[PDB]
Design a binder for this molecule. Sequence first.
Ligand SMILES: O=C(Nc1cccc2ccccc12)c1cccnc1
Ligand SMILES: [Cl-]
Ligand SMILES: [Zn+2]
Length: 313
Amino acid sequence: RTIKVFTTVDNINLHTQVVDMSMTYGQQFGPTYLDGADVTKIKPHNSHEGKTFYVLPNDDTLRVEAFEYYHTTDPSFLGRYMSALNHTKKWKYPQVNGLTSIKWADNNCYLATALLTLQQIELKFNPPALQDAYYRARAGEAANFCALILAYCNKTVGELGDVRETMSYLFQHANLDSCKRVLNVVCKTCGQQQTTLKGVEAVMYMGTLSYEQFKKGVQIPCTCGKQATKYLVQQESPFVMMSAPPAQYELKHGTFTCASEYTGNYQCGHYKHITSKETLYCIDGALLTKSSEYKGPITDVFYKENSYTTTIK
Ligand SMILES: O=C(Nc1cccc2ccccc12)c1cccnc1
Ligand SMILES: [Cl-]
Ligand SMILES: [Zn+2]
């Protein structure tokens, strides 16, 4: 007694299977999922005929398909993706000021601000999984994209992540190869030291939120025990992300693209998103407020860029 089903790792390439309806999916395929639901311990029902089940990439055909689609060989990746999807499928993705947001659930505030940020910066993903899911998220169906971020970042639904760390992981899977940064560190004692950064390290800085201050210079520790000055010589990138420990900061309309605000304590706080459009909009999941001025505990600010060369000699 049998039905026909299809197994997959990428939901595109299907593998015809004939399953014994007296045995679990588990006994025939190993761990098995139906649109995120774990059916490993369940026996085939007739309503399953012709349906697609996810399985683990446990032969060379599935390994090649999984790597080509996801760009990861982490063995627990597919199970993490399916477990998250089972939750993200039931989140709400309301359109807020023309952007896909996420209604608050399960500490997902860091994800909502990350998703809102992506839709305001020029970025293309390398893994087809992220390309296809990000296209759907932009159209309003973000369940797959959210599940993939959770899986790539090794975060479970319910865990509060850091926005900067999350953007860092997503940038590693994006085409930032054109991006270039040149830095100069001046110590009165020790003189000068020029650094070039490439890719992800060229678009991220930790220590100040102000793109203008980065250009004029910021004080950092030197090994000699003095304070050295670091400023921006040259930048080629479509955006920059300036990050700092959360601290009261004033966001001025028209001077930035968007920003992330973090309120509260370590691992038990809340992120909000601020976008600079015709005014300052504060997007907090499904919630929207406006103001002409904004002050809060800002962690990250995104700025547009193309090409910058310092006048500092
Ligand atoms: O401390 C946080 N984020 C961070 C911001 C800036 C610098 C940090 C340095 C080390 C660890 C966390 C940092 C944090 C804690 C809980 C939830 N989300 C974020
Ligand atoms: Cl993309
Ligand atoms: Zn020095």
